[PDB]
Amino acid sequence: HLIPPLNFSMVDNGIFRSGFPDSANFSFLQTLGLRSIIYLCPEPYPESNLQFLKSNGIRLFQFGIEGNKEPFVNIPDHKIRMALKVLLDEKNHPVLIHCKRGKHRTGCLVGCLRKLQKWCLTSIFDEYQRFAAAKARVSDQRFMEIFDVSS
Template sequence: MSGDNDGPRARAPAASTSSSPGAYREHGGGRVGDVAGPRAPPFFRPDTKLLVPPLNCSMVASGVWRSGHPLPLNFAFLDKLALRTIIYVGDKNMQAAYLGWAQERGIRVHHIRMESCKLPFVENDPGAVTAALEVLADGRNLPVLVHSDKGKHRVGVLVGAMRKILQNWSLASVFDEYSQFAAGKEDGDIEFIEIFQARIVYDPAHAPRWLRAGAGCVARPE
């Protein structure tokens, strides 16, 4: 009879196994096998630790980073930077968890107390900025993280002073970088950077590669 013996019937596809290409493997819950639904993306790694940088985190120069105040969820990211030094420019007491994390890793912490500029009542402190620049001018302190509370104005002033005194940047370039992080130019900070002067004496044997000698940055005589 026609239709009864039209050839071998098509076999049903074999059931997939956990070792099939593209199989989703679930770890940590006691199951390893296929899961119905969309396949996991190729970059999925259940055992990967999430790295979260601090607020407004950015590289300033080789071995120099800037940011807002780190939180515990940022510690795994900061571990990747292999920091030797932290410079905190701020007027608040540092958190015990943060100090403990730094101490466990042998990181030197410089707390340079500096209030946020609020003209005409509070001005930026040139002595505090100079003290921070002296730390930055010694390559033995790198890698270094410089941060304030939000990573905008006080650390912006410090980075601006670094660009001007230690790297001989033009003021136009300094102000442009400041405004990118500060969400608009603060007149008090801009004026401070423009008139700020310092004399930083550095050791040529330990100078960072990005340092450029100038009127405010001179090599120590041998």
């Protein structure tokens, strides 16, 4: 039996999203035929994970984004854009976007992707909320409402 990583989901044709994966997720992850992974956390990639990467020849892009709690949050506009770039490159697909719980950081990146795709904030936020659930934060969505989509 396969076990998709935490909060796993297919964003678009060659894009995927989820929380931090572990051993239990490799077999499934092996199914996607991932060509690269966009890691959004500053912590170093664990050993087992890295092994899986080499074994499977998956490029690892990492744009470390400090993870804070609602009271005072702050998303790096640059790092998101940097990730948005890689994501937008067809060459990099299949891509798996992931952070810690695959809710806020991952949720912001995918949110800006949607904005680019011309989705209304209403629809964009809704998708965002579907994953963050009880932990869905206003800050992230505000960051999206203000994202200057001008490529």
